[PDB]
Design a protein around this ligand. Structure first.
Ligand SMILES: CCCN1C[C@@H](CNc2ncnc3[nH]c4cc(F)ccc4c23)CC1=O
Ligand SMILES: [Cl-]
Length: 167
């Protein structure tokens, strides 16, 4: 039993809720919140800009030190950093950016990072401002992630369409 409330069960291990991931993180304080990161950990907008804003820019400060030490992530890759006031940890995961022509096949590699964590609160990787079809992102999540994932979807119409078109 965990504290995730009001989720609609999609599969054995995948659950979904109409919620802003930022507000959901503040309420639940999960062990792991996933950020929809880019390779430079520049948290300007989307999930990343919103999470970072909720940390009062502490996520960005930490991220800049990470990049100065380690260099950029790979598309499809991830790193674990602090969750600040939102979660114990933040798993920064880089899905491909379709607007920049990045390989959509890398979306599966991106979701594989979730399997290193038993339970996660997460957005739909590569969706939103990253340019991919959210219905496809949900499908890849279900067919790749084996650990327990709680997906927060910001947009109500999108949440409704994601649920309705699933089985
Ligand atoms: C029109 C479609 C909106 N999108 C794009 C996809 C990813 N975005 C997010 N996913 C979950 N929580 C979120 N909080 C946010 C706060 C923000 F300022 C900006 C973005 C998000 C966000 C799912 C979704 O609903
Ligand atoms: Cl977004």
């Amino acid at each position: 039993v965990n504290s995730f409330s009001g989720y609609l069960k999609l599969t054995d291990n995948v659950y979904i809720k109409n919620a802003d991931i930022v507000e959901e993180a503040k309420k639940v304080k999960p062990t792991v919140v996933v950020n929809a990161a880019n390779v430079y950990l520049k948290h300007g907008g989307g999930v990343a800009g919103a999470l970072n804003k909720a940390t009062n820019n502490a996520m960005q400060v930490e991220s800049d030190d990470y990049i100065a030490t380690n260099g950029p992530l790979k598309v499809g890759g991830s790193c674990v950093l602090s969750g600040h006031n939102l979660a114990k940890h933040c798993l920064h995961v880089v899905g491909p950016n379709v607007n920049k022509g990045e390989d959509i096949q890398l979306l599966k590699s991106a979701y594989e990072n979730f399997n290193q964590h038993e339970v996660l609160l997460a957005p739909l990787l590569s969706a939103g401002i990253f340019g991919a079809d959210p219905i496809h992102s949900l499908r890849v999540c279900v067919d790749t992630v084996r650990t327990n994932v709680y997906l927060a979807v910001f947009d109500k119409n999108l949440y409704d369409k994601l649920v309705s078109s699933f089985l």
